[PDB]
Amino acid sequence: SMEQVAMELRLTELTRLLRSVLDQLQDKDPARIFAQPVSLKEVPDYLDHIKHPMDFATMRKRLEAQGYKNLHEFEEDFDLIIDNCMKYNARDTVFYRAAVRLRDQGGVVLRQARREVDSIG
């Protein structure tokens, strides 16, 4: 149907926007602390601590399969990256501090993305 196609064009355009949002968010992590999943070889207990791990590569795979239906879903995943790190790592660590910075700097980017997704519909 033409109705199906038009929804698919909307999903594709949301996907393009979210890829530009993702690149911008990831520039706020120059140290690449959140680039990849936590290794279960190097933190074997990780899953006793954190129930839903998240990282930028995993967000990127989901994105290329057009697996984000809206901005809310994308934001949930971004927030997991941050929130997981702040629980697992103590306040005085390079990891916790990098999450605080990503959050503060990410908030600006997401403030305008929310306006662009409403705006372009």
Side-chain angles (χ1 to χ4, degrees), residues 1-2 4-6 8 11-15 17-40 42-60 62-68 70-110 112-119 121:
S1 85
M2 198 60 214
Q4 281 297 312
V5 161
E8 291 168 352
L11 181 58
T12 292
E13 285 310 299
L14 169 71
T15 300
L17 194 150
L18 294 177
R19 182 176 310 126
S20 165
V21 176
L22 181 59
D23 294 343
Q24 283 174 80
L25 290 172
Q26 181 148 31
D27 297 333
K28 309 313 168 131
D29 173 35
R32 295 186 75 85
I33 289 166
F34 309 105
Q36 297 296 325
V38 168
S39 185
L40 300 179
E42 300 150 347
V43 189
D45 78 350
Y46 189 63
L47 299 185
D48 297 328
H49 294 267
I50 299 288
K51 295 303 151 181
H52 302 98
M54 196 35 67
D55 63 274
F56 286 134
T58 299
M59 295 192 57
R60 203 171 291 278
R62 183 161 167 194
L63 189 59
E64 299 316 311
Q66 301 189 343
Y68 295 109
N70 55 49
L71 181 56
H72 187 74
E73 294 191 341
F74 178 100
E75 286 171 320
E76 285 188 333
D77 274 355
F78 177 63
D79 284 341
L80 274 171
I81 293 172
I82 296 305
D83 291 336
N84 286 348
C85 178
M86 291 170 90
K87 293 167 178 83
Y88 193 82
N89 302 107
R91 213 152 38 243
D92 61 339
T93 62
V94 67
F95 307 104
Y96 187 108
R97 285 158 183 285
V100 167
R101 295 161 59 81
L102 179 55
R103 183 193 67 182
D104 289 355
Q105 297 190 282
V108 174
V109 170
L110 294 168
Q112 195 56 35
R114 161 50 59 211
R115 302 186 62 86
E116 290 179 292
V117 160
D118 284 348
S119 191

